[PDB]
Structure formats: C-alpha cells, structure tokens
Amino acid sequence: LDQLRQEAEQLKNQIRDARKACADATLSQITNNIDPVGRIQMRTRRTLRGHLAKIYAMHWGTDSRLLVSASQDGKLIIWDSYTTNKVHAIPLRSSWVMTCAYAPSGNYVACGGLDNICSIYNLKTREGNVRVSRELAGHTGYLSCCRFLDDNQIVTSSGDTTCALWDIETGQQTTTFTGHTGDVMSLSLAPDTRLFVSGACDASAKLWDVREGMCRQTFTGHESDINAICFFPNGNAFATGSDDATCRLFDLRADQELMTYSHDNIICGITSVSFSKSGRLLLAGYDDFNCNVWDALKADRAGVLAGHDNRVSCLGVTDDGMAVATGSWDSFLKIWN
Amino acid sequence: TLSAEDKAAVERSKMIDRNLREDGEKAAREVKLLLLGAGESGKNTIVKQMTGIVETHFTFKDLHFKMFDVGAQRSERKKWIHCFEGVTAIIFCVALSDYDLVLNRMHASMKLFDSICNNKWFTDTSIILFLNKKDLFEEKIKKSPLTICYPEYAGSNTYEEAAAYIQCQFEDLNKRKDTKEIYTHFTTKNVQFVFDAVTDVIIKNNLKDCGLF
C-alpha cells in the first residue's frame, strides 16, 4: 500500500494545484465594488413557549407558517407561527431526539437521535391523531440529521460516519453514503434535491449525488468539527459552521473555499447556519447564546440576534424569507424580523 | 376579533399546553441516571438487578428511576454527552479484575473516569462509583500482585488494602472536590446504595436551593 499511499499524496497535491490554479481571485476583492448592508436590526416578533427542555432542532414547513421543533423533553411540537398556536404535540418513544424534519408536502414529520432510528409521523391521518408511519432502522450511530426528499424518500446522516437514503414505503435504506472518517453532524439538501452535502467531525464536508450514491467532491479547511451546513439558495455554494468558531463559504463549481466569517470576540463554536432568501445574509448560531448575521459577500458582521439565555442550537429561515426562527437550550423559539 | 375556528384552534392550543405541562410535572419527579464504564465493567450485570441508548425504568422505595445505558454508542462522546447534562447522578462501573488483564484495562477505566468526572457538563453532577467483581479480585490479588498495574503501590497484596488503594486512586481523579461528590461502593444492596446516593444528592440540591447548604 506504500506506493498507493504515495499515489494518494500525489493526487492530493494535484487537486491542491488545480484549486490554486483556479484560485485567481478572492471573493473579498470581487465584492469590494458593492456597498455593505446596513446594520441588520431584527427584533423578536414571536416567542414560542411550551418546550420544557433543551430545544435541539427545528424546521419550517414549506408554507412559511408552520414549523416543527424537537426538544429533549420527548416532544415534537408543530406551531402556527403567525398565531403561536400549537397545532400538534407528538410524544416521542425516545426522548433523546437530536434532529427533526418537515415533509415538503407537510403530510409527515421525521425525527431521530441517540436511538439510531428515524421515525416518520403521519400528520394527515383519518383518525385525527398523529401516529408513526414507519421507523427507519439500520444506522449504528446516533441520528444527527434527516431531510425529506418526497413523501417517500428521506436522507439521514448518522454518527456512525455514514449517510443513507431511505425508501419510506419499504423501510429499507436504498443508498448508503460512506467516506467520512468521523461522525456526520449535519446534512443539507440541494434546492433541486438531486444533491446533498454533509459535514462531519473529521473537519471535512462531502458532496454526494443522491441517485448514483457517489461522492463527487470533498471540502476541507475547518480546524474542528463541522456542526452545521447549509446550501446557498442558488445551490451552487454552501456554508459550514464549525467548532473552530468560523463559518466558511464553499463553491461547488470552483471546488474550494470562498470566504471565512470570523471575528476576534467570537471564540466559541457554531451550532447552526442559514442563508436568507436572496443569499446576501448568512445567519449563524453560536454557543455564546446569540446569533450573528453576516454579510455573505463582505464577511462583515451585519447584525446580532441576542435574545436567548442559552446556546442557540438551531436556526431557520422561511421559504419566503419573511422571518428567522432560532431555537435554543433555554427552551424557547423566537421569530425575528 | 378572532374567528370561530380561530377561537377553536386557540382552545386546542391551550389543551396542548395543559397536557405538555402535566407531562413536564410527571417528568420532573423522575430520577435520571447515566450509566457508564468501559468494556466488560460489569454494567451488563448491574442493569439486570434493577439499537443505541438503552433506557431502563424501575421504581424502588417510591422513587422512579430512569437509567440510561449509553455504552452501545460507538461514536464521539463529545457530540452527545451534553445531552445528559442534567441527570441527577452518574453511575460508573469498574471491574477490579482489570489490574493485569490487558486491553491493564484499569488504566483505560481511570482515563474514562477522569474524562467523565472533570467534564464541563458534569461540574455539579455527582458520581456513583461501582467497583464490581470484588470476588474474582480477591483471588487474583493473591496470584498476581497489584504492583503489576500500579508499580508505586507500597501496601500489602491483600484484598482489604488493595481495594482501598483502588478506591482512593479513582477518587483522587476528582479535580473539583469542592462541588462534586463521589459515592464509592463495592458490589438489593446495590439498588439500595443507588437509592441512598441519589436521595443524598436530591436533599443536598434542595438544601442549596433553600439556602441551607
């Protein structure tokens, strides 16, 4: 294998050389021409109370009105964000939930965690009660993320270093994505749904093709675990949050890092990241209990969302870009605008 | 100002709130325990006396105990250990047959105990330390001296002294003795000890809350 390891080093050098060759200009130099965004002063429009433990995940419905939140009190709550009404309260069989998802159709929600199982719930039952439609088992590590593709397809990343595509109808994992050397902590699904990107504790992010089960590209540059990952609205780029306290913007077509969002007073890790509808903003959650808004093109800290008494564990921007929701370990979700 | 169906939806939301708070009250009065210990530490037999996380629910002298065996999680503890920051106490299992049984497992057990005890998430959380397999240890000590694992041990190779040496060696790994306690025990006596330790933890937390401690 020694000669094969030398060949591997040669290939690493070749890809580095190619990326350097295409690295003609930096994003900051290109963006120097455009004006900064004014101080982004958002304020809390709603506060969603009812969770009695640390909120670990939240997700918006495609209607930009309903959102599901998962907390380790063993509950998924579906909120009417306009009125703050609770639509549903789903009791989980395992209270150690670490991720939740909302079907684009709105018919189902999913969740998972330390149980290593992704459970799908049917919201639109004739009986008038939400019940588990299936339990996707097969992961040997905790479920870190899950995202619906259709009513029948869901992709889940796990702490066993692998992601898997599932056929909810049969319960079998259609595809298994392998290659990460550490726990896969986050997973972002492309706008076209044909690609998804995952970030793992090996401080790398990989681009996968859903249908071919193929790892197309690998992105590195973080010094620590990648806790969060999000696709740029165009789908041609994505941003990663890390424990090393920096967000980084990567481009699929350029195949390298574009820009890094860091500041000296920010020494803690990043729990969640999210873009705005236009992509000009990059909202990120931090362990220091507040969320920082970043000018995605200038890397300037455009604003701050400081309203939480504990770690901001999750973010979310509605599909229409009208509001931002931030869950936190203080057990409150807040809608900002 | 609200519609009829808007008012009905609000009523539904208030019902959900009532159920949520009832469940919260039900959960608040339950004891949560985290069970740890590397390898064949005897936890597989500890769980019997009371595919990922294994939750075990039991009641003893009118306390509801939830015990979380997370030993099957072959993943980075760094990423999910904070989920348990809030458990009443941690149960740590150590096998005293691991003096010379190599992966010398007792050094790995000491490293794991050091990591768990001095974790930033468990500053207040106390530790119940179970020292299992005292029986086999009582014979192995005769045939194999304890110096094999701790060359600096100056005591006699007798059970009564070696056991105390192991206990103090594990308890000295506590770098925050001013805020955290360790309840060591050599393994209904076992569940009785768990009950005693958690009762003490609860009482001391309450006394701190009310200003008496």
Partner: single-chain antibody, 232 residues
Framework: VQLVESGGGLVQPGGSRKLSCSAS????????MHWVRQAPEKGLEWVAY????????YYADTVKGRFTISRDDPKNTLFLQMTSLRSEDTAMYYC??????????????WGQGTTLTVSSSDIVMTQATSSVPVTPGESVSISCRSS???????????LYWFLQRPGQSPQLLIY???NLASGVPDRFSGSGSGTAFTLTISRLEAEDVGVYYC?????????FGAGTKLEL
C-alpha cells in the same frame, strides 16, 4: 371512522328524550362534535356544538335551554338531552365531528343519524335555485349567497359545501370555500368571493346526484342554505 347515532323513536309533545352517538375508529376525545337536524322534507339545521375538551358549548336559538349536549370521552359517546319536545323538533338528527386547528377539515364526517318523530342576528344563506335538471358529462354549477361577507380579516372565507345523496347522510365536499375534502373527486371545485360563492362540477358523473347544501362557519350560530337538487 364510524359514527352511529341511537335513541330515535316517537315522543309525545312536551316529553323528553336523550339521543346518543357511539364513536369508533378515530380519536373521539380530540374532535369537536355537532348535532345537525333535518326535518323530513326540508334542509339541514345546526342544533348544538360541544368543543374538544367540553370547554365550549353552543346551541341554536330554537333549542337553547331545551336541549343540552354532553360527551363521554372515556366511553367515546356523544349525547343530546332534549326536553319539552315540540312538533318542530321532528327531524333526522346527525352527529358530525369537526376538529379545529390550522388547516383542518371541520365537518368532515357525518353519522347516519336517527329519526325522531313528535306526534301532532343569524347570517342568512340563500340558495335560490332549489332544483337543476342535469345530464351526465355536462358542466354544472351551484350558486350561493350570504348576508354578511364570510371573508374574515385573517384571509379565510368560511364557507362549506355538503352533498346529501338520497338515502345517505351529508358528505363534505369543500371547506373554507376552496379546499377540496379528502376522498372527493377533483371534478368538484370551490369558487366565490365576498358574499357570493359557487360550486362547479366538471364532467359530471351520475353519482354526483343529490341535494347540495352550503354552510357558513363565521359566526357560531351556524346557518345552512336551502339546498339545491340535481336530477339526472
């Protein structure tokens, strides 16, 4: 899902009687329940409502004080205590389930109902066209109007459409004037505006024959239309 009402019969005027309905195949405890009557040769009329959790109860002015509605959630049974029975109370009584949350479908299931015979302001809903000859395969339209505008501040138009085929209980077609109920063919379409609504059937099938009723859900003294008959 099944609702089976029981207790129908013949009562002398001035008497008292108790109707019952046993729920099965759904989470009865989480639904609101309605009683809806129908005189032997007239349209529907809302009687009473009991909310999920029994926190709210409503009655029609014609029965308020004479009737009382109650539910036994552990038994999954809905009741209607009735006293001072008058000749006007002679009607087929239906039990209707309705769950209220964002995006739900109130009035989505109707029981078969019990016949009760007795020995010898509100928003007005208008369905002027009482009957309409029809042939299969042709486009048809049902029209409706209301005194108040059913469009609420929050953007919802609280109009509901029901079809009662001969020898059957009413079936929900449209809720909130545009949403097609589950199990309803896409042929039916709900249109309308403030205070004027219409229901249209494209490529009408033979099974789309019966009385089409309109109902408002804006002010809780719920009112039905006179109904429109479709005949082949």
């Amino acid at each position: 899902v099944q609702l089976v009402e029981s207790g129908g019969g013949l009562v002398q005027p001035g008497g008292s009687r108790k109707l019952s309905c046993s729920a099965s195949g759904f989470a009865f405890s989480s639904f609101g329940m309605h009683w809806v009557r129908q005189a032997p040769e007239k349209g529907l009329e809302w009687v009473a409502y009991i909310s999920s959790g029994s926190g709210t109860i409503y009655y029609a002015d014609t029965v308020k004080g004479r009737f009382t509605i109650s539910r036994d959630d552990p038994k999954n049974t809905l009741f209607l205590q009735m006293t001072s029975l008058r000749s006007e109370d002679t009607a087929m009584y239906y039990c209707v389930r309705s769950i209220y949350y964002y995006g739900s479908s109130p009035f989505d299931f109707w029981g078969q109902g019990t016949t009760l015979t007795v020995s010898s302001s509100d928003i007005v809903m208008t369905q002027a066209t009482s009957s309409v000859p029809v042939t299969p395969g042709e486009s048809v339209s049902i029209s409706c109007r209301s005194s108040k505008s059913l469009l609420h501040s929050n953007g919802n138009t609280y109009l509901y459409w029901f079809l009662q085929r001969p020898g059957q209980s009413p079936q929900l077609l449209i809720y909130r004037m545009s949403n097609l109920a589950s199990g309803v063919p896409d042929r039916f379409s709900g249109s309308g505006s403030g205070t004027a609504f219409t229901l249209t059937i494209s490529r009408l099938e033979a099974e789309d024959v019966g009385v089409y009723y309109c109902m408002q859900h804006l002010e809780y003294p719920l009112t039905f239309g006179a109904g429109t008959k479709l005949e082949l």
